From Swiss-Prot:
It comes from Homo sapiens. ISGylated. S-nitrosylated; negatively regulates the ATPase activity and the activation of eNOS by HSP90AA1. This is Heat shock protein HSP 90-alpha. Residues 1-209 are annotated as: Interaction with NR3C1. ATP binds at N36, D78, K97, F123. The modification N6-acetyllysine is found at K43, K69. The gene is HSP90AA1. It is found in: Nucleus; Cytoplasm; Melanosome; Cell membrane. Molecular chaperone that promotes the maturation, structural maintenance and proper regulation of specific target proteins involved for instance in cell cycle control and signal transduction. Undergoes a functional cycle that is linked to its ATPase activity which is essential for its chaperone activity. This cycle probably induces conformational changes in the client proteins, thereby causing their activation. Interacts dynamically with various co-chaperones that modulate its substrate recognition, ATPase cycle and chaperone function. (Microbial infection) Seems to interfere with N.meningitidis NadA-mediated invasion of human cells. Decreasing HSP90 levels increases adhesion and entry of E.coli expressing NadA into human Chang cells; increasing its levels leads to decreased adhesion and invasion.
C-alpha cells in the first residue's frame, strides 16, 4: 500500500532550483545530510537524559556512510531520533515553506546554494547529486516507514517491508550517472575532512569488498 502525495508548491520550487541551477560545488550535499544526522542524534541524546528507556532501541549514537558502486548508491545512516509518518509527510520534519521563502529571498540578496542548510532545508540538497532519494526511518513507538521521491512534484510513503532498523534514519541517494565520484573512498574522506571535520558523533566510512 503506497500513498502518493504532491509536494507543496514552495518545496517543488526549491527542488526545481536545486536540480536546474548551474552550480558546480555539489559536494556540500554531504555536509548537509551529516548536519541533519547530527541534529537527530542530539535530539535522541537530550530526550534520553530524562528517559533512558528511549535508548532501548539502541544506545550507540553514530553516523555511517555506506557507498555501493554496484547499486550506485550512497547511504547516510544515523541512529538519531527518527521520524514519524506525519513528520515524513510534513517535509521530513523541516520548516520547508518558511525556510524556502527565506532562502529564496537570501539568494536574491547575495547568498548562494551552499547556504541552503542555514534555512532548514538542507535535506533537499541531496538532489544536487541524486536522481532519486529514499528515506527509511524508525521513531520509537511508531512503525518503520519509507519515503521516496525522484522529484517531479511528488513523493511516496509506505510502511517499510525491509529489515527492521532499531531507531533512526537512513538516507539512500541513488546517484546521477555523472556523480559517481561520491562513491569513491578518497573523495568521501576528503569532503568529510573539508566540511564535517569536527562534529559531536563518530562517522564510520564503510569500505567495499
Amino acid at each position: 500500500e503506497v500513498e502518493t502525495f504532491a509536494f507543496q508548491a514552495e518545496i517543488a520550487q526549491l527542488m526545481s532550483l536545486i536540480i536546474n541551477t548551474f552550480y558546480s560545488n555539489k559536494e556540500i550535499f554531504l555536509r548537509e545530510l551529516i548536519s541533519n544526522s547530527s541534529d537527530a542524534l542530539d535530539k535522541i541524546r537530550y530526550e534520553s537524559l530524562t528517559d533512558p528507556s528511549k535508548l532501548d532501541s539502541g544506545k550507540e549514537l553514530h553516523i555511517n556512510l555506506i557507498p555501493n558502486k554496484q547499486d550506485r548508491t550512497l547511504t547516510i545512516v544515523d541512529t538519531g531520533i527518527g521520524m514519524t509518518k506525519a513528520d515524513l509527510i510534513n517535509n521530513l520534519g523541516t520548516i520547508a515553506k518558511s525556510g524556502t521563502k527565506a532562502f529564496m529571498e537570501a539568494l536574491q540578496a547575495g547568498a548562494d546554494i551552499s547556504m541552503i542548510g542555514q534555512f532548514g532545508v538542507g535535506f533537499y540538497s541531496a538532489y544536487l547529486v541524486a536522481e532519486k532519494v529514499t528515506v527509511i526511518t524508525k521513531h520509537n513507538d511508531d512503525e518503520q516507514y519509507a519515503w521516496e521521491s525522484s522529484a517531479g512534484g511528488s513523493f511516496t510513503v509506505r510502511t517499510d517491508t525491509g529489515e527492521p532498523m532499531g531507531r533512526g534514519t537512513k538516507v539512500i541517494l541513488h546517484l546521477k550517472e555523472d556523480q559517481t565520484e561520491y562513491l569513491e573512498e578518497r573523495r568521501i574522506k576528503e569532503i568529510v575532512k573539508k566540511h564535517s571535520q569536527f562534529i559531536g558523533y563518530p562517522i564510520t566510512l564503510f569500505v567495499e569488498k
